[PDB]
């Protein structure tokens, strides 16, 4: 545990998991259910917030760019998978916008 | 229009830095030239073109009042390239690197943002 993935728990995660757009990243993407069949092909490292929320819980991180770099990669993994004027695509913006905007204001040491 | 503060301050001077000199940080130091380039359909899809030569222009001008912003255009310079690119070419891999490079050094940056 440190005061940067505190601040990440419960103003970030907090935040981005009771967003109206965040269903679709609550859970992994099942590439059955949506009819995706190249979707693990495309997409190496699968990340999702229920993950990331799980690992916060259970004190799976290290550190806080850990956290930081899962949360990059579930956006990234959207905007490079899908098409450029998918609704997902906007919604994983809208999403990485409240990200950034409180990433700015976290703790800059990292203290155990 | 912006002002000086102690976050943009690390966001030009360690985190742009570090970028910007990076092996792979080459085709993002400018504009993309969709002619030069020949990529015709390029601003049809990117309606927000973003490169670092345009965010240290601004970071130099005064351009941003907080470092959120700041770092909204980083975002849209790497969101453009996973948008427009086929996820297997190289351009894809090497945004991939510098925006991990990104998130690492911005982790470090300055908690209170003081003017
Ligand atoms: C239901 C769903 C779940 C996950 C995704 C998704 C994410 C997230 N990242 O890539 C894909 C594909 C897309 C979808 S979706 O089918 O595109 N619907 C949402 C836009 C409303
Ligand atoms: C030369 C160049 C310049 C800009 C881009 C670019 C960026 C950046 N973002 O989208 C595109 C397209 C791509 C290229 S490129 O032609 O894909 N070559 C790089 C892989 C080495």
Not at 37 to 60: F, S, V
Not at 73 to 79: D, G, P, S, V
Request: aromatic share 12%.
């Amino acid at each position: 545990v440190t005061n940067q993935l505190q601040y990440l728990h419960k103003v970030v995660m907090k935040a981005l998991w009771k967003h109206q757009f965040a269903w679709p990243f609550r859970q992994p993407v099942d590439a059955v259910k949506l009819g995706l069949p190249d979707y693990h092909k495309i997409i190496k490292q699968p990340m999702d917030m229920g993950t990331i929320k799980r690992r916060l819980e259970n004190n799976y991180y290290w550190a806080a760019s850990e956290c930081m770099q899962d949360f990059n990669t579930m956006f990234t993994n959207c905007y490079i998978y899908n098409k450029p004027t998918d609704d997902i695509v906007l919604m994983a913006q809208t999403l990485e916008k409240i990200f950034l905007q409180k990433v700015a204001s976290m703790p800059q040491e990292e203290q155990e």
